[PDB]
Amino acid sequence: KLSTTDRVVKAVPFPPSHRLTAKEVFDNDGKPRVDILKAHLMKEGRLEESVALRIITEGASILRQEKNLLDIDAPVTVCGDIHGQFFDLMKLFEVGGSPANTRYLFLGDYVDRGYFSIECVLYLWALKILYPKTLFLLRGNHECRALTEAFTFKQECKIKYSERVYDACMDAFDCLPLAALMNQQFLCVHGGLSPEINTLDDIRKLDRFKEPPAYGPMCDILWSDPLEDFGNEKTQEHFTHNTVRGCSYFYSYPAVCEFLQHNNLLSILRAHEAQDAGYRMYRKSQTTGFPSLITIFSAPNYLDVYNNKAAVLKYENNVMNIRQFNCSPHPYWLPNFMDVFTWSLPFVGEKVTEMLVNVLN
Template identity: 55%
Template sequence: MILKDHLRKEGKVSKEDYPITIVGDIHGQYYDLLKLLEVGGDPGKTQFLFLGDYVDRGSFSIEVLLLLYALKINYPDRIWLIRGNHECRQMTAFFNFRDECEYKYDIVVYYAFMESFDTIPLSAVINGKFLGVHGGLSPDLILLNQISSFTRFQEPPRSGIFCDILWSDPIDEDKEEHAIHNEAYFPNDIRGCSYFFGYNAATTFLEKNGLLSIIRAHEAQLEGYKIHQTNIKTGFPVVITIFSAPNYCDVYNNKGAVLKFDNNTLNIQQFSFSPHPYHLPNFMNLFTCLLNRGLD
């Protein structure tokens, strides 16, 4: 109840100042979250903005949420959470978070987490210059205050601004691609929903809203981050992707990274994965696992 009260009061666009550490996808990698907090700074002295996708795929999503929620309650003016596309009923039932809740606790705990997800803000503005979202932009999103025009206290819809800021991806067109598409947005056929948005879409949105760059998560990166195309007017990247789950799913062998702002200086700090206890796939028990292997 205390947590939901904190999150409900924050509105859909929260505003944070420097210094701040910005964190991308975590995906249930609790032991990497502990390392991330060592790298990112003391939560009692440094603000943290988490860009969503706290759950699924990893085996310790509950532990991730309990730690983040405890930090939010203890440091309500320093810990900021926004919602990712996995913070919903559809994705957590399809992937493994619902199974994790039922395995470790029960379905009541799962439903309580779902209710908490419905209160998480959708975006953040950092120092009046940077927009933090999980996914990206929407063709329907012209002005930032439009995010305040709909209710977030619900399961994300399958289309519209709410959907797109959780699901969309930037695309780095070269000149030939841009000539072919010649559009700011086009359907995201890789994800099967939402859109790709290009350089023109990003620069137009940033200029209309007096912003410098979009900082987002949502896509695994080998180095833990990606600096997208540079704005020819400002000399600053129009989009920065940050991904904070090293060795993603125990197979990608990627680095994790966080983005740190302090005194108008941007630094990206990388970190490697941390060892973690082993769980059988889908939280299968040992007896069932051995039985299945015996039947093969």
């Protein structure tokens, strides 16, 4: 009948086993060859450990020389959470345009939850090497050690590469800028505002080359959310304890609007919170007539269950163009990268034992 050696479902391509070398990932000038890298990672291809570390460290060196608060001019396509959904990241660049001719800004949460986080890091770091002054990456609350060891990035790295590659990602993440000032109008962060941050200068004075502390302004940038009832304030408090996160704070519509007014800003662009449409426009500020807060979320069908759209903000020609997209197929992993023997063997022992017991009564 069906072969016992040859693969049953031959329409599925067998993933490549060869690990790409330096010569194959970097061209004659040392520029990453992103087409090779994309094609190879789309097939679940892996790199040699030394090449992976080169991408991470060379990207880190570029990030290490950028400011806490980037100055990014328009036009630019702003993007929210990715959470290891590499194949939606492929779709994302289709929707927003190739980075060869498109300025990009990412607000963090590249890893965890999705099971292609290391591919997201490697490809985005390779783009950052190739386009150091037109593709920008900020830190999210997940680009740290506390979360990657609790969720799945650390395990993913140990499964596909090594803890050394993981450690290298952690040192690289410590270099990620925290915020961007976009076209002199928008503060861009992963999470939001801090009680201890009242000026743009307060972000500039921070020391970011560290694990995120458990409290403080750096924590707050990566962790804060708008109030559940943002804009319908019976609450009077500008900042209150964020009981969803267990740390940092909720910030209110008066809090956001005062910050915008003090610092001469149009809106706050952030991410950090899933949205059914991939974005949310919050109540306009009464002095700007413009949404005080914008959440952008770029991980469609989040966790393979939310069934949400994802979106990016293309800001260009004084138009804020929301571009939505749907999820794309992605190869399957068992939860926590479990192999099929570990998965099924307890069921084998169970059912052969059950059969034998029934055979014998």
